[PDB]
Every structure is written in C-alpha cells, then in structure tokens.
Design a protein around this ligand. Structure first.
Ligand SMILES: Nc1ncnc2c1ncn2[C@@H]1O[C@H](COP(=O)(O)CP(=O)(O)O)[C@@H](O)[C@H]1O
Ligand SMILES: Nc1ncnc2c1ncn2[C@@H]1O[C@H](COP(=O)(O)CP(=O)(O)O)[C@@H](O)[C@H]1O
Ligand SMILES: [Mg+2]
Ligand SMILES: [Mg+2]
Ligand code: NA
Ligand code: NA
Lengths: 311, 315
C-alpha cells in the first residue's frame, strides 16, 4: 500500500460567515450563513491528488480537539494515510476565520495553531515512507525549519520535491529554491518573492526567470483564467499554457487543486512532458472553479474525461 | 425540581481569534490564539440567574452538531435544565465569529442559525415548563414571532414577563410592549426604539416614558457605569439607581448579567421593591465587569456578599 505522494504541511478548519457587508471596528453585525469546511493548503493538495487516484500520506499536526478528530476522519474519508497525522494538547487545530460579503470581498484571520508544532522529530518518524515516495509536497503554512527538513530528507532519498511558497514572504530562505525540483506559485506570490509587477503572461515569464536564477530547476507561475507559465533550467524560454475558458462558480482553492494534480502526474505519469502535465493540471483546476466550497469542489477521477489518464 | 426562571432565547458558539490588530478590508492577518466560548444573550442571562441559585430552564434550539452537543454540556455544567433544549438537522448551531485586538477592540459577526428555527411546536411542547415558572425571559436573537409567542404563553399563564429587546429593531410589534411586565434595554437600544439621544439619566427618563406609554408595566434603561433608570405604570416619575464605582476589566456581557440577576430577584424575592431589586442587580453586573470573558465573569452566590440574599430591604 506504498504512498507515492507525501504531503508535509497544514490542516486548517475553515470558519466562514457570509454577510451583506463587512463589519467596521467595534461593530457587531448579523450574517446570513455560516459553514465549516476542511482546508489548509497541505490537506487541500493531498485531497486533490488522492481523488485523482494517488496513494497519499499527510504528514501534519492537529489539536486534541473536536476540529482535530473531525480533520483525521476527513483525511480517512478521502483515502489518505493518517499514519503520521499527529495530535497535540498544546494548541488548537489551525483555523481560518473568514468573513465574506455578497460581492466576494473578505477579511481573514488565520491562527496556524497545532500546525506550527509539527517538528523535526515528528518528520524523522516518517523517514521510510518519505524514502519510498515519488513526490514530496510542501508549502509555507507550517514552521519553515520543518518544511526545510522535509525537502532535505526528500533530496537525500532522490524523491522529487514540489514546493508551493504559499503564503509567500519577501525574505524566503534561499534553501527553499535550491531544494525545489518544481517551484509553483501564483501571480501575487511571484510579486512578493521577486518585487516585480505581474500583470500578464510576459511579466510572469520575467518573474519566473528571477526564481530560476535563485536555484529552482522548474518554475511554474499560475495566472488564474490565463492558465500558467513554465520555464526550466533545460528550457529557460517561458512557455504560456492557456486553460479551459469556463464560467467560474468559486475560484477558492484552485491553486491547491492545480498543485495536487501536478503531484499526481509527477508521481504516476513521469513519462509525460511537463507541458502535457501542466495542460491536464490546468484542466483539473478549471473543473474545481466550476463548483462551490474548496475541498468539496475537487473532482474525482471517475467524473473526469478518460483522456486525462492516458498516454 | 420545578424551574422558577424559564429563558426562551439564544445559544451561540463564540469562535474567538486574538490578533495584535484588526484586519483591513481584503486583508488576511495571522492571530496568535483561537478559542471557543459560549455565548448568546438567552444562555448568558440563564447562566447568571443559575449561578445566583435559580432553578432555570433554557428553551432553545441548537444544531444536531458538535457545537450543539458542546452547548448542551455547557448548560449542564452551569446546573441549567436542558429538558427543552432542542436540536435540528436543518441548521447549524448559532455562531459568533469574534476578532479581538490587544486593546480589546473587536469585530463580531453573528449567524443566528438554529436559534431562528425554534418554533411554535417547540414552545407548545414546553407549555408545562412555561406555565409552572415564576418568570419568563426573552430577547430578540430568535425569530421575533417566537419571542412574541413565548410572551403570549407566559401572560396567558399569569407568568411574569421580562423582555430584553436586544438587539433592537426600530419598529417592534406593539404587542411586545403590551405583553411585557418588565421591559429592559441599554442606551443604544433605547435610542433605536425612541429616536432620542440616551446619554445621561435625564435623557433616559425621557426615553423610558416614551416606552412606558407604548404599554409596558415597567421600563428599565441600563446606563453602564451610571447604573439604571426605572419607571412604572404605578410610579411614572423616573428613578435613577446608581451602581458600585469599580475598576472595569471587561464590560462585555454586563447587560446579560444584569438581566439574569433581575430574573432571579423577580422569581425568588418577589416581595422586594423594584429599587431594591435594581440595586442588587446593578451590584451583580458590576462584579461581572471586574473579570474577562462574558459567561466566565458571571459571579456565583458563594462569592457574593450575604446582604444580596436577604429577604428584607437592606440599609
Ligand atoms: N477563472 C478561472 N478559469 C479557469 N481556470 C482557472 C480560473 N481560476 C483558476 N483557474 C485554474 O486554476 C489554476 C490555479 O489558480 P490561480 O492562479 O488562481 C492560484 P489561487 O488564486 O487559487 O492561489 C490556474 O493555473 C488555472 O488552471
Ligand atoms: N463600568 C461599569 N461599572 C459598574 N457597573 C457597570 C459598568 N458597566 C456596566 N455596569 C453594570 O452593568 C449594567 C448593564 O450594563 P450596560 O448598561 O453597559 C449594558 P451595555 O450597554 O454594554 O450592553 C449597568 O446597569 C451596571 O449595573
Ligand atoms: Mg485564483
Ligand atoms: Mg456597557
Ligand atoms: Na471551487
Ligand atoms: Na466581564
């Protein structure tokens, strides 16, 4: 039952209130709807890869609380290995409290909580599962020392590293670049990392070259409805890969859908060209934007065209 | 065993994030702590009355969900009867999403949820607990038609009605006034209901008289550190009842403490004058503002002065 995709990253409870307008300082307002969902970039990416057919393992930490218990059940209901899903009494399960108005404007408060207490001792326990994987995926929602050690362990075992610098910090440790076989971010993260404005595929190609020279082997910048741009040490000329023109219902977590799809193709279809993998990943992310509710929008293999699983 | 105070009203899960500052519009920030607390004006008033030694019953509706199950455990931990706490598959437990900065400034979004599905069938099933009570307390955090039905059932049963029009609506149904034995609101609610300024005891006397003439038997406007102002159909000249001068730590939920204390005295010390009941209720609410965290700040009888529980008028 070997995991081909290991995700070392975050699980977060999403707490969403829908309002007619955002509250002002000192203001109590009444919203019209509240819901809970399962989020966190690590878990979102793992759930998309699992639903495409990947054997996955989620290395993460949640609270010894109701939210933590519910999160472990969510991973098992998506056929994800929870062998190295830890729980702790020392902090609450990570939370994202989101207030959203009718026009889709928001205010968000994140408390990473238990996610931050995933430590190098917890990783070292997963050494054998990491060593037998094809792809290791990380983000920036846990403690950086933990993510850096995960990428180091992957490299030592010859496991391909897929790094998503999300959310982005302007002074990212240079080892994040040099430990990344595939570096994938969105337009706003590329602007934070490079200081360049990114308002077109051409601008994304300029930002991607900066990231390449910092030591990345492959750089992908996602561009929402414009698909993505890719370049590599072997092919440094930026290629624009356009996506399905669709009617977006809810673009929340499309980035995570795209990253989880890419992990699945890197693990299970290593013979496909990068261009082909990014075309399929674009298509899967595009399906996700045509439904509401983050993980509940992620498509399963049985509902996707057969051609996404050929060649 | 019989509940003398029946609260027909709201339970809300408080989902609290602590941050160094409140976010800007479109802004994502990191906070340093998230925790769950128990709120809702109905439950808050019930908890204060129960901690003063009242046998209470909370008529309410929560989700058939973990937040609802946890709310029922909270009520039981405060020795409240949950025999008429309903659940529903058709709505989540009410929620208050609260962001609090380091100076204690906040943003709150309330989604009433299951509280709005408390219905006429649910109240009819609670008819015996209502008819056996001394005082029925309600607010405006459930469907207002539901609060109006509870007040109607109380009045028909000769049960004293204590109505807190919170949060306030500018045009309440006229029966909210005529069915209220004791109508209790704060300065901001009085301003909404009357169209007047309510800043001082003098302003509160004018606003309280407009409310009394809509058909309330007793009107009480709370004035924070200035205590409260009362008048009644019997004694329409407003009286100003001042409160304990105290060093406030956290005034959140002081209104609910005051209303819960008042319910307690109406139920267990009916002999006392309104002025004596308000003096004691003010004192209890002032203890609550000396500690953080709404329900967790509400004092127990064992920690209060014995003089609050004398049957007779005290010096
Ligand atoms: N409006 C839209 N129409 C079609 N595809 C979309 C789309 N928004 C996003 N996608 C797809 O989802 C991928 C990732 O989306 P983003 O670049 O928006 C990352 P994020 O905004 O979720 O962080 C894109 O590369 C694209 O394939
Ligand atoms: N700073 C303070 N010092 C003493 N008592 C206070 C107080 N703030 C509130 N109280 C007590 O709590 C009662 C209800 O308080 P409020 O009138 O503040 C209700 P709110 O406007 O904050 O909802 C007051 O009548 C008084 O007895
Ligand atoms: Mg997007
Ligand atoms: Mg106050
Ligand atoms: Na979606
Ligand atoms: Na308090």
């Amino acid at each position: 039952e070997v995991a081909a995709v290991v995700v070392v990253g975050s699980c977060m409870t999403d707490l969403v209130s829908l309002t007619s307008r955002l509250p002002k300082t000192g203001e109590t307002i009444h919203g019209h709807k509240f819901f809970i969902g399962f989020g966190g970039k690590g878990a979102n990416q793992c759930v998309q890869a699992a639903r495409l057919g990947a054997m996955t393992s989620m290395v993460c930490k949640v609270g010894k609380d109701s939210f933590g218990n519910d999160y472990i059940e969510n991973l098992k209901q998506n056929d994800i290995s929870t062998e190295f899903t830890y729980q702790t009494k020392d902090a609450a399960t990570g939370t994202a409290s989101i207030i959203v108005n009718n026009e889709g404007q928001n205010i968000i408060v994140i408390v990473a909580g238990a996610n931050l207490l995933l430590n190098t001792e917890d990783l070292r326990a997963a050494a054998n599962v990491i060593s037998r994987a094809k792809v290791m995926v990380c983000q920036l929602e846990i403690t950086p020392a933990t993510s850096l050690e995960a990428l180091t362990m992957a490299r030592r075992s010859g496991v391909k590293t897929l790094f998503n610098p999300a959310p982005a910090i302007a002074d990212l440790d240079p080892q994040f670049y040099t430990l990344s076989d595939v570096f994938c971010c969105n337009e706003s993260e590329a602007e934070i990392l490079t200081g360049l404005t990114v308002g077109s595929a051409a601008d994304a190609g300029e930002a991607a070259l900066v990231l390449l020279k910092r030591g990345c082997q492959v750089v992908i910048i996602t561009l929402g409805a414009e698909g993505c741009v890719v370049l590599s040490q072997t092919e440094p000329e930026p290629k624009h890969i356009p996506t399905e023109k669709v009617k977006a219902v809810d673009t929340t977590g499309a980035g995570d859908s795209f990253v989880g799809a890419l992990a699945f193709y890197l693990a299970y279809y290593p013979n496909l060209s990068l261009e082909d993998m990014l075309n399929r990943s674009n298509f899967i992310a595009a399906v996700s934007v045509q439904a509401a509710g983050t993980q509940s929008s992620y498509p399963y293999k049985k509902d996707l065209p057969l051609t996404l699983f050929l060649e």
